[PDB]
Amino acid sequence: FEGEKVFRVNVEDENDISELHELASTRQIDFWKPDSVTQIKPHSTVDFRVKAEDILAVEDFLEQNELQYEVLINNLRSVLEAQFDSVSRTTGHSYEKYNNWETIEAWTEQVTSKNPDLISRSAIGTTFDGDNIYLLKVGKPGSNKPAIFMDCGFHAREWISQAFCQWFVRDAVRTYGYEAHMTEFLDNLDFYVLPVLNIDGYIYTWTKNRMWRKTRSTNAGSSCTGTDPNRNFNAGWCTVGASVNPCNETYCGSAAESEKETKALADFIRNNLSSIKAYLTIHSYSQMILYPYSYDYKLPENDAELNSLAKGAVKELASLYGTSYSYGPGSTTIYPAAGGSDDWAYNQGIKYSFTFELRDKGRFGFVLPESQIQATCQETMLAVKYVTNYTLEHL
Ligand SMILES: [Zn+2]
Numbered sequence: 001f002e003g004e005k006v007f008r009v010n011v012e013d014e015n016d017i018s019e020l021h022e023l024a025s026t027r028q029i030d031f032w033k034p035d036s037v038t039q040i041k042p043h044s045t046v047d048f049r050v051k052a053e054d055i056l057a058v059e060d061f062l063e064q065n066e067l068q069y070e071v072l073i074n075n076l077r078s079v080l081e082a083q084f085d086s087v088s089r090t091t092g093h094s095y096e097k098y099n100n101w102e103t104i105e106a107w108t109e110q111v112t113s114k115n116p117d118l119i120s121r122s123a124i125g126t127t128f129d130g131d132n133i134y135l136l137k138v139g140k141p142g143s144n145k146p147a148i149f150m151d152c153g154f155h156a157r158e159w160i161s162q163a164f165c166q167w168f169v170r171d172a173v174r175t176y177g178y179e180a181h182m183t184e185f186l187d188n189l190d191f192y193v194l195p196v197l198n199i200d201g202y203i204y205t206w207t208k209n210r211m212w213r214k215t216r217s218t219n220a221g222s223s224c225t226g227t228d229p230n231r232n233f234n235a236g237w238c239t240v241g242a243s244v245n246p247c248n249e250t251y252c253g254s255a256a257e258s259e260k261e262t263k264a265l266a267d268f269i270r271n272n273l274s275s276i277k278a279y280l281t282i283h284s285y286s287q288m289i290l291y292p293y294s295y296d297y298k299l300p301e302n303d304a305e306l307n308s309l310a311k312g313a314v315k316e317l318a319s320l321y322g323t324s325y326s327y328g329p330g331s332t333t334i335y336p337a338a339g340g341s342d343d344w345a346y347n348q349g350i351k352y353s354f355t356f357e358l359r360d361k362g363r364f365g366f367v368l369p370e371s372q373i374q375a376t377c378q379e380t381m382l383a384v385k386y387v388t389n390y391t392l393e394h395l
Helices: 014-026 052-064 076-081 101-114 159-174 180-188 199-207 260-271 303-321 341-347 370-392
Strands: 005-011 029-033 044-050 068-073 119-126 132-138 147-151 190-194 276-284 288-291 326-329 352-358
Touching (some): 005 014, 005 052, 044 052, 101 199, 132 260, 147 370, 159 180, 159 190, 159 352, 159 370, 260 341, 276 370, 288 303, 303 352, 303 370, 352 370
Parallel strands (some): 147 190, 147 276, 288 326
Antiparallel strands (some): 005 068, 029 044, 119 132
């Protein structure tokens, strides 16, 4: 990634957008936010990364076409090297460093051995490459308890996400029998934590390409690999904001629940549907909290409640470090996109469905350094406990 840059471009009107369709059709641009050219709306900003060889061609195009730009990241290489900056001496699992999957997979086992009373572990299926999808069920085991489902690592390159589901499990165990609310939550609820949905991708971002997002499944008729897991749900499946071309990053898959991974999660949730009261899905970057709908401009019945709950949670979050989040329904907060899990869980009847986009807001983007793991996870924990406490009192 030596000499590659990340740009922030502003787009004023629809001609600006169609000018960026022509750019994209001519250079290989990696869109960071939004996740495709097709999801840009006027009067907004677009973050994307450009290959070293393309830097001058793109800075001419923007200039010659009046697109006002800023260089977010001058050398991605540096940012990639600053990444692993944990002041931890440990070769194994740390909560304050980014763990590879071998290391995560062994952690799920160890943490279950060490806190058998509070933690239980399953494999809810197997990934494309045959990796096991582990789910941890966190709670004081009880007759007929309501649940909260939380997953991380749907998109391979959003590593802070993966880091969060681990932190959560560490706190849930540390503050049991010491923190009043956390002890009552684990008594009253179970938490289902799926620390990594897209394992195959995650390993690919470790081994080959840090910037990968999709699954690693093979596509018929093409040598292009992967579906976007957050387009592969049966919520308006592929009807807007999603491609049928497998070589796109927004490839919606060949059918709803075409991925093994997303079929496992969808099935697990459906089998438990009467317990699970809330659905939380952790992504990165940009500091937002989204709630349904993304597939449509229609508002959920619930809208006013979800809106106030989001506003409260984002108010909690900021307490610690002053971190600003924004929130709203996904379609107008961003742009319509079909097949996401939040919209699907909601349409299953789960009234409280959120996506969180953690830090930052583009200084590092996906390539957030290990040094910001902990602060990031502490403030999120504050929005997470708030909403848990909300749901508990509305069961
Ligand atoms: Zn994501």
